[PDB]
Amino acid sequence: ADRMSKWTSKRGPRSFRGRKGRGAKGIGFLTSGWRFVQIKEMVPEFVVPDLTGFKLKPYVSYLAPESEETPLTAAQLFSEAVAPAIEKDGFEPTQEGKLFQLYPRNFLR
Amino acid sequence: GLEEFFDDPKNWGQEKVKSGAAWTCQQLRNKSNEDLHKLWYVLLKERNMLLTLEQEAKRQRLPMPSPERLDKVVDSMDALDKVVQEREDALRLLQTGQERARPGAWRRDIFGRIIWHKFKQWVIPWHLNKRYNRKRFFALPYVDHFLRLEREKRARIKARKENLERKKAKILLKKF
Amino acid sequence: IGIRLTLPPPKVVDRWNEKRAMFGVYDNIGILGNFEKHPKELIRGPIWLRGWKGNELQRCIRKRKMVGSRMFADDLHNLNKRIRYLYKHFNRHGKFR
Amino acid sequence: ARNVVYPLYRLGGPQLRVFRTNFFIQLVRPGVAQPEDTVQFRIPMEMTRVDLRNYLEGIYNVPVAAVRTRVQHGSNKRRDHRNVRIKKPDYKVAYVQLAHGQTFTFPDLFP
Amino acid sequence: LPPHYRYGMSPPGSVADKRKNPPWIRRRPVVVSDEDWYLFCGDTVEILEGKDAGKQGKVVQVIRQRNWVVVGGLNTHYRYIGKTMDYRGTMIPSEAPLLHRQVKLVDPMDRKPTEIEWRFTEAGERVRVSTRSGRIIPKPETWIDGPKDTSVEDALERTYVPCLKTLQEEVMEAMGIKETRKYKKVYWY
Amino acid sequence: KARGNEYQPSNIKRKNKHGWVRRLSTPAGVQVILRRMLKGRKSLSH
RNA sequence: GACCAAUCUAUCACCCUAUAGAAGAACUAAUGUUAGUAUAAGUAACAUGAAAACAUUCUCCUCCGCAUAAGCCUGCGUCAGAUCACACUGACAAUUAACAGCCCAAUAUCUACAAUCAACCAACAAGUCAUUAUUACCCUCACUGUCAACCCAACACAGGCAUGCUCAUAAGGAAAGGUUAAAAAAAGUAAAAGGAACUCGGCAAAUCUUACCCCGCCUGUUUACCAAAAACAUCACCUCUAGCA
RNA sequence: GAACAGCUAAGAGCACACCCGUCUAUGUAGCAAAAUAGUGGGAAGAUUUAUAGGUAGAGGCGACAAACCUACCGAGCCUGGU
RNA sequence: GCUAAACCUAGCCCCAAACCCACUCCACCUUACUACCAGCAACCUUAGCCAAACCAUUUACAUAAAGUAUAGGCGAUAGAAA
Ligand SMILES: [Mg+2]
Ligand SMILES: [Mg+2]
Ligand SMILES: [Mg+2]
Ligand SMILES: [Mg+2]
Ligand SMILES: [Mg+2]
Ligand SMILES: [Mg+2]
Ligand SMILES: [Mg+2]
Ligand SMILES: [Mg+2]
Ligand SMILES: [Mg+2]
Ligand SMILES: [Mg+2]
Ligand SMILES: [Mg+2]
Ligand SMILES: [Mg+2]
Ligand SMILES: [Mg+2]
Ligand SMILES: [Mg+2]
Ligand SMILES: [Mg+2]
Ligand SMILES: [Mg+2]
Ligand SMILES: [Mg+2]
Ligand SMILES: [Mg+2]
Ligand SMILES: [Mg+2]
Ligand SMILES: [Mg+2]
Ligand SMILES: [Mg+2]
Ligand SMILES: [Mg+2]
Ligand SMILES: [Mg+2]
Ligand SMILES: [Mg+2]
Ligand SMILES: [Mg+2]
Ligand SMILES: [Mg+2]
Ligand SMILES: [Mg+2]
Ligand SMILES: [Mg+2]
């Protein structure tokens, strides 16, 4: 009997305690006989490259110069990638069957 | 290895570190994608190390040598994330001209307030999903009274703030 | 104790203020301004009244029939309650009858 | 990552990738002296067991054998002058166990 | 922080400041305006009120939150710092703030208290200019690399190549990972 | 007998008798939640 | 009818006063409201078993204690300061699943002989547990609960709380702050002769008990919170209504 | 779904747990805005109870107590008319 | 002299004037802050207190005309336009 007490998994009964739970993000499902199925495709794979011979460092030196901030826009990217437009003197309009679709967020981060 | 969770043992017990200057936005924009990913990974490792050091210091009941480095690492991570988001937004605008990565649309719930409904992504269409069918979207007429009451409360708050600013300006003028 | 102790600061008062020095000016324009504007239009106040004394109940009915069309819900309800109470207290309660 | 919508894998979809991880992790000192080669970790909420396993195996390459996570509850018996409750931030805890009997010991600082 | 925060001499992040202004104070906020500030930290100023009404010094701190300016070696009040134990201890002359107007800026060679204007010059653009004459009053006022420091040229290589290739796809192509599977269409409601 | 003990706490019955679903099924609970939001309370319903 | 304490307004005042405009304009009381403080009052209520090297030992009680569904959320462990002395104030971290929860692809389709040691004996209240053929399916250990002296009664409340367990022991606790025992009351031990003769009543405590009248079939329920019945209900009888999904 | 020792031997009898409280005494700003012991009736059945859902006032329910419906029900409180 | 006594600035009411707000990141109608899979939903004469000493028909939601006509258990009252 508390309104300010935020409802969580440490309050309700066994049913709601095991149903809700913290941000678990369902990775698989159950198969009748309480036999969870770990879908290998849904398990994330941390793509970590090799940090061999890295030049930069997580900290910069104050001796470096200072430059103005200019948020990149679509016009600048178009002006940069302007090779075929000038050669006229390749584009992906429809990307429904593409690997990582742009408009519908299908790629993680 | 687990040794990466801590800095150079030679620096253990000094209350001073020589490292600062966070990665600005222009410096991150002037870099490739692989270099940006490597820098992000190194910054994440440094953040993990600094968080472990902070927890150890809190457990040992001692102050921090210099959280400025942690603040600068967090700022650099935020700047890298913002640059990546801006690049993705530019690519999306040049590919389809669609605003906001996550799709959505405006809708009217029961309260009537125009809320930006967020898509949950499903497998089956909407004309047969039992759960989504229950999530109706209409305010009905009787909620007009509550909407008018909320609008009147907002107008009262705005008028109160305006009179407050006017009285403050009058008092300031009286003082001089 | 109810009475305070230390006296107050010197309440400065500018008798020759911009409003005081011009208070009552440009009034009575009708008797000598070939009658062009009534003094009742000079006062700056409510819109439902601007040159009519009246009374409490009468002023309330005026504000209702002149501003009630754009008044808030709670304000309109309070005004109606006040009008009804004033009517019940005037046309029934009282003395000399 | 954390606080980000994931792509629902139907059936014949590609392998789920995770570029530029958001959530972080940090180890702490054993509370009641844990067994050998048993490292503790304070994991946020949006993180599972296999997630941490892959995270470690990909970043630090630590030969993680078994993991056993759990959620901890934050204190809440404290009020300010306003008589308002204060719930500390909750976090998940894990007990990673190295393989091959590497035998790891929690290092100490501030000599 | 809550509104009407009486900014004291101590910064808004010290133990003394927190002890002075606990989270249950409701004092009377002092009235202060004056957005075009000009008194910076380290400027030759001259006091014209109270003690040392003429002696020049140097500004140390400038708390613009309440229009306060601290000068070095002027308007100092003595204090028994700490004292740790129950005895004499040691006395130190602690400075005090001073509101603007009363404390004006000092000229280079003239060395007199005069008002400064914000004239838009051709140098781009607004700069201090005395009233008695020109005199552009200037503003007031080494790092060896470390183990985790980048450099001076690595951060200016400019390796970005604008190409519609996406970061995820580029990383996948660089790492050599292959995935012939296709992403079937999904619903969004 | 002791009449100072009538409360039998149970999250199930509590959420079933005063739940968002039950408060939005009928217009009664809708008006209740609207009035609560207009009043300015922190918690709208259990 | 004659004056007048306070305020704002327009008038020279300016160690506090005058002319006119206004009343939310003037308190010994309305078992009036808010804040502190007298009054019974330092009176009623109150705890902490003993020795001691504070290691440890001794005396007594126990229908209580163990784990769990319901319920709470860190609520007598450490670190420094606060004090019947402290569970009080700030940091420390716990509680890691194998126990329980989080659970079932479709189409036609069918389970007459209950359980009660179920075989003798059977009975009425007729009863809790099953699958057949085809299609497609082959990746497998993800998430939550795990503490305490604990829940609901405004209190640290002789009060209320289910399941499997020895119910007195391997669990669980201390009725006596220290002195004397004035008066009154209550819970217990015994009583020289009577055993109900004070009392409207055999109404507390002990025997353990014989024969009657009224009413109620007997069980069961009622006015939770003063009346628990000679009232309420029916196994038995009887009146009326209804020819149907 | 759960509970009902044992003893004598059937909506049988005594009696554990357990259900309610006919009576005394204490309490009456107390342990309690309804408590403490036995004498009390039942305790394989009109029996008690853990969980969930349904019956809401011109109403529901009611082995009629014109009783109960969140401490005060000859009809619980709130809102707006008041 | 213990306990006490005062500070006034944050903000409030009136109209005078415009017509207001509203998605960075995940989460929210199932048990709200829950990534995930086969089924009806809408439009309703408001009553009532009170006054006629009860009470049923009755009782209110710029200026002048005018509180006139008119309606009214023709009594308490209501009350327009050209
Ligand atoms: Mg009580
Ligand atoms: Mg008085
Ligand atoms: Mg009295
Ligand atoms: Mg009085
Ligand atoms: Mg007395
Ligand atoms: Mg004791
Ligand atoms: Mg436990
Ligand atoms: Mg004593
Ligand atoms: Mg004898
Ligand atoms: Mg005798
Ligand atoms: Mg006698
Ligand atoms: Mg006699
Ligand atoms: Mg007798
Ligand atoms: Mg007998
Ligand atoms: Mg009978
Ligand atoms: Mg009674
Ligand atoms: Mg009785
Ligand atoms: Mg009967
Ligand atoms: Mg019968
Ligand atoms: Mg009796
Ligand atoms: Mg009495
Ligand atoms: Mg009986
Ligand atoms: Mg019996
Ligand atoms: Mg028995
Ligand atoms: Mg009622
Ligand atoms: Mg009346
Ligand atoms: Mg009447
Ligand atoms: Mg007209």
In order, the DSSP letters of B121-170 are -BSS-TTS-HHHHHS-----TTHHHHHHHHHHHHHHHHHHHHHHHHHHHH
Output the DSSP codes for E52-68. Answer: SSS-EEEEEEEETTTTE
d(CA D73, CA D79): 18
Q: Is B152 on the interface with C (CB under 8 A)?
A: yes
Which residue in this structure is represented by tokens 């980000």? D4
Which residue in this structure is represented by tokens 């204090």? E79
First-to-final CA distance of chain B: 68
Helical axes E167-175 vs B33-60, angle rounded to 10°: 90
Residues 6+ apart with CB under 8 A from D2: D22, D23, D44, D46, D47
In this structure, are residues F45 and F17 in contact, taking their beta carbons and an 8 Å threshold?
no
Residues belonging to chain A: 109
Q: Is E158 on the interface with A (CB under 8 A)?
A: no
Q: Exposure of A22 by Cβ count < 10 A (0-12 exposed, 13-18 middle, 19+ buried)? A: middle
Q: Could you say which nucleotides of strand G lie within 7 A of any protein CB atom?
A: 8-12, 14, 69-75, 79, 89-97, 100-105, 139-146, 151-154, 159-160, 224-225
d(CA A70, CA B26): 7
DSSP code at position B33? H
Q: Which of residues 3-42 of A touch F (CB under 8 A)?
A: 3-4, 11-13, 15-16
Q: At how many Å resolution was this determined?
A: 3.9
Residue B57 carries which side chain, given as an amino acid letter? A
In this structure, are residues E100 and E39 in contact, taking their beta carbons and an 8 Å threshold?
yes
Q: Given phi > 0 = left and psi -120 to 50 = alpha, else beta, which region is E167?
A: alpha
Residues belonging to chain B: 176
Query: How many domains, chain C?
Result: 1
Q: Which chains touch F (3 or more CB pairs under 8 A)?
A: A, B
Q: Do B142 and F27 touch (CB under 8 A)?
A: yes
d(CA A49, CA B38): 8
Angle at E156 between CA E154 and CA E160, to 5 degrees: 100
d(CA E93, CA E71): 13
Experimentally, how was this structure solved?
cryo-EM
Nearest CA-CA distance, residue E185 and chain B, Å: 9
Angle at A24 between CA A18 and CA A30, to 5 degrees: 60
Q: Exposure of D25 by Cβ count < 10 A (0-12 exposed, 13-18 middle, 19+ buried)? A: buried
Residue A55 CA: distances (Å) to CA of B7, B69, B77, C79, E70: 19, 20, 18, 77, 46
Q: Residue C96 belongs to what domain range? A: 1-97
DSSP code at position E127? E
* Omega of the bond leading into E125 within 30 degrees of 0 (cis): yes
Residues belonging to chain C: 97
Residues belonging to chain F: 46
Residue C30 CA: distances (Å) to CA of A9, B30, C36, C40: 81, 78, 6, 11
